[PDB]
Design a protein around this ligand. Sequence first.
Ligand code: NI
Length: 341
Amino acid sequence: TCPFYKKIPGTGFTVDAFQYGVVEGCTAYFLTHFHSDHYAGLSKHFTFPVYCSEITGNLLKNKLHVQEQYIHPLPLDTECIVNGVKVVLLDANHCPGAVMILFYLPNGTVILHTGDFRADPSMERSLLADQKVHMLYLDTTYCSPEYTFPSQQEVIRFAINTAFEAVTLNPHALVVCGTYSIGKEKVFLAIADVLGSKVGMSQEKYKTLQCLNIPEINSLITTDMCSSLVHLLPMMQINFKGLQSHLKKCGGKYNQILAFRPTGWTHSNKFTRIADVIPQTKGNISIYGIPYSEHSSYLEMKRFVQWLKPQKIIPTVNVGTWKSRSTMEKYFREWKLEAGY
Ligand code: NI
């Protein structure tokens, strides 16, 4: 059955709750973003109203084949009414089309659901600042002080300069970027832009990108692999074996590969700075691990919550074990005691 952390009290709404069949009482199903854990259970067979951003609606329509009659896209930063309740969608700074939802309940309670997010100080001057928020449903992916990472911009600058130098040194080098869902598109778009190239990719991946309302997209991406010096492959192929194999397929148009694996956090965030990063190398193929995150670091999450000052916090990630919930409760109390709410 549908957990309490996916229900919004005093409405018949749910959020990211598609895997439990018909939820009793639910009149509107919200979807924060198009990642499989969150959409799990949605298909052409779903017949209830789904509320979401325009981008998320394009993906539902085209990738999952959800029938158009059930897709209710809403604009961002706009007060809307859904089944008699006022709502607002805000940018989550996660993957394309990802939203936070603000629910104004009829009793006067205000609830923020973050979905998946990467907290940023620009969220402190949105519509959130206009009134008190009583309850927060929080993306707690990285809720522990060891989880630090550089900014997106530091990582992109590093990627840019690395690729530019490698291809100026050897103009027959190919650049490859690994991927498994939407998100982290700036990695490959920024590398391509400094190399004067489009990004080449499979038909399924191109179809995905074509749904994302990216300006001038037709000038940036192609299905013609041969005409392009940056290629996208599945993350699973980003290894020496997979990369040698792809290099055989390109027809001796390239004689070297430089590949990037954008990851989340791994244990080497604790010492290394981005400027110290060195690749793994076997022969004419180099692989760089780069920690480009679309979730809040501990410090970014703490700052956001300490600003917002919610009366109650409901975690939405790592809630499956008592040990994790207990640990998270401890950090929420520290934050409250330090800031005085
Ligand atoms: Ni996500």
